[PDB]
Write a protein that binds this ligand. Structure first.
Ligand SMILES: [Zn+2]
Ligand SMILES: [Zn+2]
Length: 582
């Protein structure tokens, strides 16, 4: 409590002394309340006109149109403390997992130089506006770094002054750029040096890309065992216990010098003790604290969620294999059996999983896993959309398993070679490309975002008839040499001015470890589609009157957009298709 959060609270109280008041009608039960002060202010989703003008048939599909119109009673719930047996299982497993992750890696501090480059190339670090306008301006002004140094030396002392969260199935907690830097210095190595790559972590997929995930699921499917299980958790970030935050901190045991102390401080002072400011309309600013749940930076959140999720799923596996009998209490001989399992088969059991933060696919040794629920429920990782004690429903086919919002098809080229391609309902893909976030978008910038989406569709979704055609139309409608842009930046190989057929060959043939024959593809017509009936199942409008009219008359839609943008240098990409090729 207050000897760690006090100083932070004291400092804010004073800056709004003319507004302070301990409000008695406060809507908090599970958060600790501290006081309120006067504020008044709020960002909605705008339509990309370039993409909408080249996707007319979809102007009458509600699933697409509604996406562009528009829980904080789940952040106010309290997780129970686990049993002693559960806590023992978690500490042993965490201890062992950090050793394994650390066998071929060296913890190290990230640098101002490294941080500066990040900001000067638009990564979404989640900072606030005020003294300097943007992030960019603050990074050259030596004043900033004197503030950063004040807080830094404070953290070495073991106290905090300026590290305070701002809260705006999602909940995003911005800090000021300074506190983001100090988080990056101490914990950035996890992302920057790829601790959760598949090579290093065996379960993880950090930096793999959407064109590898299908191949990774199929490799898992090849192992002997039961169904593939893919249970989603209900509000994962709100079910992170203090015991979870403590096992995460054991990464510091692998550190030394300044680093160990700086990392210890972030975990102690910001993660395991939180100070947050929230807008309430009855408008005031509420200064609340609590000890548990997740609210770090989105990139460190990712890596820590993967770590804790790896830990939970190895434990659920142990329960299915009958390594321990009850969560109430671990005997002495059970501790040695758990430790022996991890040493004998742990690495093999990690390779049976694909884990991306809160998202997992598990192919266990057999189907006992399905009704092994006691550890999972007691750790607080309650399954979404199924009764607490009802057994999990597994999948019998790797092409039906959901993972990172996709499913994966197996697709045979005319030359016999095999692609594994990502897919989702086509209304979701078209609906997202019609949306832009923010204000002050020039026509040129709107066009360049449209082009980023088209290049993505050509590289990942080439097998959907409607998306190859819409992609060709957009790349024809936007000046050939204008560079694809994005304001909120996995592997993004479509962000480039290089020839898209040359990128396709590098990604799917040259650099693809699942493809033995390296024979380049000479044109887009060598590159196959899903079956027509499969394309309709995944949402294609192939076979409708509206869709045939759009395709027939596509050069008229292309010319409409060219007339609005003006007299520039354009390329016709539509003769790359068979039906437009004379
Ligand atoms: Zn601090
Ligand atoms: Zn599909």
């Amino acid at each position: 409590n207050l000897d760690i959060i006090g100083k932070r609270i004291e400092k804010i109280k004073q800056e709004h002394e003319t507004s302070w008041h301990y409000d008695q009608d406060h809507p908090y039960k599970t958060w600790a309340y501290h006081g309120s002060y006067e504020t008044k202010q709020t960002a909605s989703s705008m339509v990309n006109g370039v993409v909408r003008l080249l996707t007319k048939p979809w102007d009458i599909i509600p699933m697409v149109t509604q996406m562009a119109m528009t829980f904080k009673e789940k952040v106010d719930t309290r997780t129970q403390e686990p049993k002693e047996g559960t806590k023992k299982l978690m500490k042993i497993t965490a201890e062992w997992l950090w050793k394994e992750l650390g066998k071929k890696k060296t913890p190290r501090m990230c640098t101002r130089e490294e941080f500066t480059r990040k900001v000067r190339s638009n990564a979404a670090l989640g900072a606030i506006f005020n003294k300097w306008k943007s992030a960019r301006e603050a990074v050259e002004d030596s004043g900033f770094w004197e503030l950063v140094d004040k807080e830094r030396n404070l953290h070495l002392e073991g106290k905090c002054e300026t590290c305070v969260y701002n809260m705006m199935s999602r909940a995003i907690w911005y800090m000021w750029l300074g506190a983001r830097f100090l988080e990056f210095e101490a914990l950035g190595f996890l992302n920057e040096d790829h601790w959760f790559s598949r090579e290093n972590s065996l379960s993880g997929v950090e930096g793999e890309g959407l064109h590898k995930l299908g191949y990774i699921l199929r490799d898992v499917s090849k192992k002997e065992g039961g169904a593939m299980y893919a249970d989603d958790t209900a509000g994962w970030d709100t079910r992170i216990t203090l015991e979870d935050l403590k096992n995460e901190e054991m990464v510091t045991n692998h550190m030394e010098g300044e680093h160990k102390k700086l990392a210890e401080a972030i975990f102690k002072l910001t993660y395991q003790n939180k100070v947050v400011r929230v807008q309430r309309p009855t408008t005031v600013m509420d200064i609340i604290s609590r000890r548990d749940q997740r609210g770090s930076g989105q990139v460190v959140t990712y890596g820590l969620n993967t770590f804790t999720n790896m830990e939970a799923q190895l434990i659920r596996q142990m329960e299915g294999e009958g390594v321990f009998k009850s969560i109430q209490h671990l005997t002495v001989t059970e501790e040695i059996a758990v430790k022996n399992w991890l040493v004998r088969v742990g690495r093999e059991r990690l390779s049976r999983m694909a884990i991306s933060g809160d998202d997992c696919v598990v192919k266990p040794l057999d189907d006992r896993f399905a009704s092994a629920l006691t550890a999972l429920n007691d750790m607080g990782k309650v399954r979404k959309d199924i009764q607490q004690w009802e057994p999990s429903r597994g999948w019998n086919d790797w092409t039906q398993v959901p993972f990172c919002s996709h499913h994966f098809h197996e697709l045979i080229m005319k030359d016999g070679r095999v692609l594994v391609v990502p897919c989702r309902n086509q209304d979701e893909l078209i609906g997202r490309a019609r949306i832009s976030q923010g204000a002050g978008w020039s026509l040129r910038e709107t066009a360049c975002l449209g082009k980023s989406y088209a290049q993505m569709w050509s590289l990942m979704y080439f097998h959907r008839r409607d998306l190859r055609l819409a992609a060709n139309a957009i790349c024809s409608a936007v000046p050939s040499h204008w560079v694809p842009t994005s304001r909120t930046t996995a592997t993004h190989e479509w962000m480039t001015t290089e020839d898209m057929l040359t990128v396709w060959n590098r990604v799917w043939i040259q650099e693809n470890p699942w493809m033995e024959d390296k024979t380049p593809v000479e044109s887009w017509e060598e590159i196959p589609y899903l079956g027509k009936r499969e394309d309709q199942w995944c949402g294609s409008l192939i076979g409708l009157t509206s869709r045939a009219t759009w395709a027939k008359n596509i050069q008229t839609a292309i010319n409409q957009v060219r007339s609005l943008i003006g007299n520039e240098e354009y390329t016709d990409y539509m003769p790359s298709m068979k039906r437009f090729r004379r």
